[PDB]
Design a protein around this nucleic acid. Structure first.
Lengths: 97, 49, 97
DNA sequence: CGTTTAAGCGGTGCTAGAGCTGTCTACGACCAATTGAGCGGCCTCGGCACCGGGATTCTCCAGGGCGGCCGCGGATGCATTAATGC
DNA sequence: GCATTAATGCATCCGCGGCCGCCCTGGAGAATCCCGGTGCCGAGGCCGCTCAATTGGTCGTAGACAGCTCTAGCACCGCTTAAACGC
């Protein structure tokens, strides 16, 4: 007799788990090589401090959280629980972008 | 290891524990809580630095 | 044999008629008594110039037109042609208000 | 579709608040001398980090009594065929 | 040798019997909260230092106070249609 959860249970406790945590969900090294990758073709041989990387990752994380909340309400307006690409284009375009 | 450490603190479920070398680096916050009598080091040319 | 249009024809020629016109759709006297009505409980015995009323009516009209366009696209996202109150709350909330 | 109330507009008598201009006078810009409160440096210890013990509530688990079937074989009808009587 | 005829080897037809699956009730299992238990480390206190705030003097300078003016807003009266409204 295996013990399995029904679909829709672990997402709620993942919301309860991650919504109580203030930690960053993106690792430092792929964001480091990504920031250096975008910084490669703009100005060659640049340097980055130990600071000012968790600021970009922090504003990217919180701005993406607010974008997922507005897109989540946009998917709520469509009377379903799934997020779609047209919800991201709708909630992205309606914010003035 | 959480299953090994759920009969660990209050009673005496073991007279001697077998812990690897590299696991105390991650579990150093947990193994420092309990008092021990003997801690031995096998092949101590690894801790020579 | 009466001559009547099918429902959906006169709205299109009303769009063609009013979208070519730059005139104001709100009368001057109800907007005058409305502006004086909101200006009554703030500061008593105020005066208004002959200007600065079509500026409020112009920004109200154009801002309400852009709100009706964003709300119209919000009703387009709902796969229908009717505007609803939750479309106004959706397009109003998603603009940062 | 017909029926009404009221803005648009032409014209009127005002006035009270908008708007440009001298006076001087508080009153703030510009400059020496002191210093004391605020800033670099330090080094501790009590609140903080993480997890066991145990109670508590969370959240799913598998069997038990009510319906209308198809699977299959016995049959014994049919048709054949050799026995056999002519 | 041929008909016929009883034996008989299959005939499809009929009738009987087996096939379980979905609601209701048997609790099972582990995630969470809270209270200690001890090792860790940076918040703040203390000290050394040190520099723009503070106080006073000078000096000149725009802002409130009238002063006077002037001009479009205010309130209004009456044709003239025209969107608003009821259905």
């Amino acid at each position: 007799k295996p013990h399995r959860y029904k679909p829709g249970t672990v997402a709620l406790r993942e919301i309860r788990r991650f919504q109580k945590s203030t930690e960053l969900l993106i690792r430092k090294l792929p964001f480091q090589r990504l920031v250096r990758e975008i910084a490669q073709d703009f100005k060659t041989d640049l340097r980055f401090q130990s600071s000012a990387i968790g600021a970009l990752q922090e504003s990217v994380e919180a701005y993406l959280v607010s974008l997922f909340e507005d897109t989540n309400l946009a998917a709520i307006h469509a009377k379903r629980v799934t997020i779609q690409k047209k919800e991201i284009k709708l909630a992205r375009r309606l914010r003035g972008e | 290891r959480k299953e090994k450490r759920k009969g660990w603190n209050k009673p005496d479920a073991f007279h001697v524990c077998i812990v690897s070398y590299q696991l105390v680096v991650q579990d150093q916050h947990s193994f420092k809580r309990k008092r021990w009598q003997y801690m031995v080091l096998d092949e101590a040319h690894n801790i020579k630095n």
